[PDB]
């Protein structure tokens, strides 16, 4: 819901709510930085590991999506619920009969 | 007048005052140690006087 969240929360050091003679050729510890600019903050608030959005809480076995070409090809072998076969949108029994 | 510059200048003044009081406290500690040594000598002399 947050606008531009990929660069405000997941991309910006300090989540965008922080402001931004350092020597050159200096090895700094990964937990901090020189502080020259936003890309090199005094304290790095972004992790160096892999990022991943939380696993979707949307039910997967209940939502009925549009039928694909491969799904139509394998429709005869595939099983399904009665609601799957007589779905309100994109019924599968009609596709099987066709 | 100065949101951060005034804070830093007052910090400098406070640091100067703290440094002066720190050196004064070091002098006080030195004189207190000398007083402790004097008291120890006086107590030893009083013990051995008899």
């Amino acid at each position: 819901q947050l606008q531009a969240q990929d660069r405000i929360i997941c991309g910006t050091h300090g989540a965008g709510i922080v402001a931004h003679p350092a020597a050159d050729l200096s090895r700094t510890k990964p937990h901090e930085g020189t502080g020259t600019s936003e890309r090199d903050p005094y304290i790095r608030t972004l992790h160096n590991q892999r990022s991943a959005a939380p696993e979707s809480s949307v039910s997967q076995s209940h939502t009925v999506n549009a039928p694909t070409v491969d799904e139509c090809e394998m429709l005869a072998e595939r099983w399904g619920t009665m609601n799957y076969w007589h779905n309100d949108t994109f019924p599968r029994l009609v596709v099987f009969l066709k | 007048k100065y949101g951060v510059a005034g804070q830093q200048h007052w910090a400098e003044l406070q640091a100067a005052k703290d440094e002066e009081y720190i050196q004064k406290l070091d002098e006080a500690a030195e004189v207190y140690k000398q007083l402790l040594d004097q008291s120890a000598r006086l107590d030893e002399s009083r013990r051995s006087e008899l």
């Binding site: 606008q3 531009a4 405000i8 965008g16 709510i17 922080v18 402001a19 901090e32 502080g35 005094y42 304290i43 | 949101g3 951060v4 804070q7 830093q8």
Partner: protein, 52 residues
């Protein structure tokens, strides 16, 4: 070793008190583009510096 680097970090920390949240605009992409001067009609000429 003198420690003025962590003094710089502490000065940044105490400066963060007086800051306030910047205004990224309602349309953030539009606002960032306007700041960059990229959209049509948003070009601003640099000030005419006096010659030496």
């Amino acid at each position: 070793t003198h420690g003025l680097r962590e003094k710089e970090k502490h000065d940044f920390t105490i400066l963060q008190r007086t800051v306030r949240i910047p205004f990224q605009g309602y349309d953030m992409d539009r606002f960032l583009a306007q700041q960059k001067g990229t959209p049509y009609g948003a070009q601003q000429l640099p000030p005419n510096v006096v010659p030496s």
